[PDB]
Structures are given as C-alpha cells and as structure tokens.
Structure 1
C-alpha cells in the first residue's frame, strides 16, 4: 500500500489526480500526504527551514480539524484545493512570478481555507443566530473562522511550521493568507471576477513571456483568484471526479435543507431534496459562475489552461445531455 500511494503521489503535478484514491491509500490523510509531497516538490522545507516532524505534526492536526462527517467541505476537499492551487502555480505564464513566500502563502491558504467547516452556509449560520455569526458580525463568518482556526493550530505542540521565518516574513505571509482566504467567500465572487476581467483587459507581459505583477494589489489579486479557481475547480476535473464532488455537495446541501425545513425556515436554493434538479443546477452553476471564472483565468494565462477549459466545457455538455 505504501508503494501504490507513492505511485499515485507521482501525479501531484497533474490536473485530475486521483484524490479520492489517495485519501484511501493514505489512511484518510490526503491533506497531510499531498501537502508533504508538494512541500518536497517545491523544496519548501529547505527554503524555510521547516522541520519535517513539525510539518507533519501541524498537517495532521490541521487535517484533524476538518470534519470527517461533512460530505463536501472536508479534508479531501482541502487536499483537492491544495493540489489544484499547486498545479495552477506551476503554469508557464506565471513562471518565477511569485516569491517563495507567496507560493508558501497560497498553498498554506488553500490547506486551511475551509478548516472546521460545519457543512452549512454563511447565510444559514446568520439566519439561525449561530455563535459563529454572533462572533463575526455576519461578515464572511465561515472564512474568518477558517483563518482563526488555521493560525491558532500553529500554536499547538511542535506545530509552528513558520518558526524559522523572519518576523517580516511571518507578518507578510499572515497578511497574504488572510487576504486569500477571505476572498473564498462566494459573496465576493462577482467583485473578484470583475477585477480579474479588468486585469486581463489591461494585461502586461514581461520580455520572458510571463505575467508582469509589480505591486501588491495585482499580485494578491492573482493569488486570490487562483485559490478561488481551485476552490471552484470540481467541474473542470475528469467526469468521474466531478460526479463524486457533485454527489457530495448535494448531500451537504440536502442535509442543510432538512435543517431549514425542521426549523420552519425557507429552504435555500438546491437544498430541497423534494424539488431538486441536480443536473440543471450543475449546468447553471457552470454557465453563470464556473465557466465565466475559468474562461477569464484561461485568458490571463493563455494558452496554459486550454485543456482545463476544454474539460469544463465537455462536462457541461455531458450534464446538459442528461436533462432531455
């Protein structure tokens, strides 16, 4: 089993990694083994003097604080978003564009971005007067919580993977990680996409053909959109992966709708298992959210993302075909 898992992890640089199989082969530690593999691939342990035992201890603790009984927003999703961000970071149009600290921030942000997710939405937490919504004044409730937990866990025994960064490196990384995870709040999607469109329309490219990003605002905007794309990457994956992700988010949505029904609240969209259309919901999600985002990302890094966009368009055609 160790051999086959190592074989599977050789695909860490590929879109379409068998992340559910890696979850199985790793003993439900996809986030730990995928993060560790990526950190070794990018030489991040040597670059930031991260003790390997500290890295594993933090990663296992972080993975533990994802909920194993949440169908979608769990450690497999976190590992998926981490690996997808890792691939997007390697795209040729971004070669040598980001520093080692920005790469570390984007990967760390992806790892923590949904930690301790309870499997219900921000609006559900707000409408039920949850403790979380009271703590965070109804504003990016979950995303603020994911950040707070992700950073707090660094203070557990032998968990401070950033112990050997300088003070300015720690300060800069913390700000970047916060800016990235707050951007995963879906209520910010339209604004994030509008800014990504503006950047594509005004794109500048250096003499070496890579993206020119000469200020923090543009650099962090690209990283925010990158992790957002990774978060919304399920419909761009091979269909056997996409359908499993769809099964899982529908189970989470239906369980939220069951709670909304039991409480006498209006049922959130796609959350009523009695009047649901899973296939129409996926086509509309692709048409109105995922394809607009990925077509814009593909424009930013053209032609690097052509195969990903082609898979997305094929999957939309397939889900559409199941409707008539």
Structure 2
C-alpha cells in the first residue's frame, strides 16, 4: 500500500504545478489528478488510499449534471488551492493542507444551478433551514454526510480535537465561497494589510486569509488561458440564464446578469466583474501571499482579452 505513488503523464506532471493548468476533458482522470495533488501537498500518509478513493467517488456522485457548478468545477477549484499551497509551502499547518483541498472538492456539493437569491424567491425548503449562505451551508452539511458514510472517514486517524479543527476549517472555507461575504472579507483584509495589523498567528486573521484563498480558487476560471476562460464563461451564463428564465416563470424580472435577452452585453458584464470582483480579489491575495502573483497577472490578461472583444478585435 504505502510505496504506491500516483504519477501523471509528463505534460500533466509539469503543467499541474502551474496556476493556469486545465484538468482536461477526460472525467475519469480527475480523481487521479486530485489524489496526485493530495499526495504532493500533504504526503501519502495524510489519508488511507481506499478511504479517500471511496470519499472522492461519493463526492463526485453528489455533484449534479449542471453546466457550471459540477464535478469538473470542484476539481478545478481544488487544483487552484493546490497551486497556492505548493507556492506557499511553509505558511500553512498540516491540518490546513488536509482540510482545504477537501473543502475545495466539496465546496459546491449537490449544487442545483441556482443562486441563494432564487432559492429565497422560490421559497425552497433549504431557504427556511438556512437564511444566509443558503447553498453554502447545504454544501458543508452534504460534506459531513459523506464523511459519516461507512468507510468514508478520511480523518479517522485525527484526534477528537484535530478532527474538530479540520471540520471547522472546512466549514469556514466552504461558507467563504458565498460571494456576498467576499466584499467585506477583502475590505477588512485590505485595511489590516495596510495599517500593518495583519497577523497570521491571529486565528481570526488566518480565517480571513483562507476565505480570500477560497474566493480566489472559486473564481480561477478568469486566471486560465483565454480559450478556457472564454468557454467557461459560456457555462457560467448557461446557468445564470436558466435562473433568469425561472425568475420570469415566478413573474419577476431577473437582474441583467441572468437575462438571456442581454446576451450582447456579456463582454461589458465581464469587465464589471473583473473590475468589481476578480482584480481586487487577486490583488489583495498577491499583497498577502506574494507568490500567487501569476493569478493576478493571468486575471489582468483576461480582462484585457474582454476589452479586445468589446473593440471588435476578437
């Protein structure tokens, strides 16, 4: 068992270390890619291989066949986390390394392709059970479910309190993927960085830094090669526009983001998004973790590609 290191073909073995890596269209290799990432950022010791394989496959089963919030997104977001963890070797604890790749794999579990807002206006049962971060509290809830299935406790070797710390890291990490919470979280971090109050030994500071990392991994489609960025945007809008249709079915005008009638304004919508969300996100993250700069650089390159689309040059 212990002498069994997962290895990847040469092009993957090299490119998986880069922020901009695309996990590819071969579904059946994504589990191997994830285990490869856990082994290298954590050790072959972190998890019993049989248990982790059974956990990876139960997680996969519990993502749905929606255009964007799907199993490929889960593995994409984990690979970004893996790049961050490997470019900041010594800044993170053994538990953080363990908890965060799992958090990323699990962070959109059982997503239905609809925003918290649509669940609230539809009056979905999840919206009574969880008034804020509706889907994100569901995602953590599903994570705990899969962990408690026979033969799925990958954290079995942890002490009662180490186990509690790691489930607490996953919960806070998954909650942070609620983009409503990101704005405030980044503002606080900007201020603490600049007044020089930012302290990585302050647990509530680390928490904030991990939440910014989670937003960064979650938005990582904007840090890819242009053709990956552009084709992921089509999946993103395919969800948003179905939500827009469902909003109209309830007798509600959707926000412009979700109206397929406003297809032509996508380039301008992306600009706003890169300016309002992505750039500030990767800027503040680069300030706090200097070696994540390639994400900011790749983000600025894609903003510049959407500007070209608007100018009729693409």
**TM-score, normalisation: structure 2:** 0.91
| Ranges in structure 2 where 5+ consecutive residues have no aligned partner | 1-5
In structure 2, which of residues 12, 16, 20 is the aligned counterpart of residue 16 of structure 1? 20
In structure 1, which of residues 179, 193, 197 is the aligned counterpart of residue 190 of structure 2? 197
1:263 is aligned to 2:250: yes
Residue of structure 2 equivalent to 1:223: 210
Residue of structure 2 equivalent to 1:148: 141
Residue of structure 2 equivalent to 1:208: none
In structure 1, which of residues 124, 128, 151 is the aligned counterpart of residue 122 of structure 2? 128
1:97 is aligned to 2:91: yes
Cα deviation for residue 265 of structure 1 reads 1.6
Residue of structure 2 equivalent to 1:296: 284
Cα deviation for residue 308 of structure 1 reads 2.5
In structure 2, which of residues 208, 214, 228 is the aligned counterpart of residue 241 of structure 1? 228
Whole-Å separation in 2 of the counterparts to 1:84 and 1:65: 21
Whole-Å separation in 2 of the counterparts to 1:18 and 1:5: 14
Cα deviation for residue 134 of structure 1 reads 1.5
Residue of structure 1 equivalent to 2:77: 81
Whole-Å separation in 2 of the counterparts to 1:214 and 1:43: 21
Whole-Å separation in 2 of the counterparts to 1:45 and 1:95: 17
In structure 2, which of residues 147, 156, 161 is the aligned counterpart of residue 168 of structure 1? 161
| Ranges in structure 1 where 5+ consecutive residues have no aligned partner | 205-210
User: Is residue 232–residue 290 contact of structure 1 (8 Å, CA) maintained in 2?
Assistant: yes
Residue of structure 1 equivalent to 2:50: 53
Map Cα deviations across residues 53-100 of structure 1 (whole Å, 9 max, x no partner).
Answer: 1100000110111112x1111111110110001111222xx3312111
- Of Structure 1 and Structure 2, the greater helix share is in 2
Whole-Å separation in 2 of the counterparts to 1:97 and 1:218: 13
Cα deviation for residue 257 of structure 1 reads 0.9
SS at match of 1:275: helix
CA RMSD of aligned residues (A): 2.0
Cα deviation for residue 43 of structure 1 reads 4.0
Q: How does 1:250-289 map to 2 (within 5 A)?
A: 250-276=237-263, 277-289=265-277
User: Is residue 180–residue 227 contact of structure 1 (8 Å, CA) maintained in 2?
Assistant: yes
Map Cα deviations across residues 122-180 of structure 1 (whole Å, 9 max, x no partner).
Answer: 000001100111221x2110000000001110122311111111111101111111111
How many pairs were matched up? 304
Whole-Å separation in 2 of the counterparts to 1:298 and 1:60: 34
Give every structure 1 segment of 4 or more consecutive aligned residues whose post-TM-superposition deviation is greater than 4 Å: none
Map Cα deviations across residues 2-35 of structure 1 (whole Å, 9 max, x no partner).
Answer: x99634541322112122x2x41x43x52x2232
User: Is residue 9–residue 37 contact of structure 1 (8 Å, CA) maintained in 2?
Assistant: no
Map Cα deviations across residues 187-222 of structure 1 (whole Å, 9 max, x no partner).
Answer: 112111112202321448xxxxxx961121122221
Map Cα deviations across residues 275-296 of structure 1 (whole Å, 9 max, x no partner).
Answer: 2311111111001111011111
In structure 1, which of residues 76, 95, 107 is the aligned counterpart of residue 101 of structure 2? 107
**TM-score, normalisation: structure 1:** 0.88
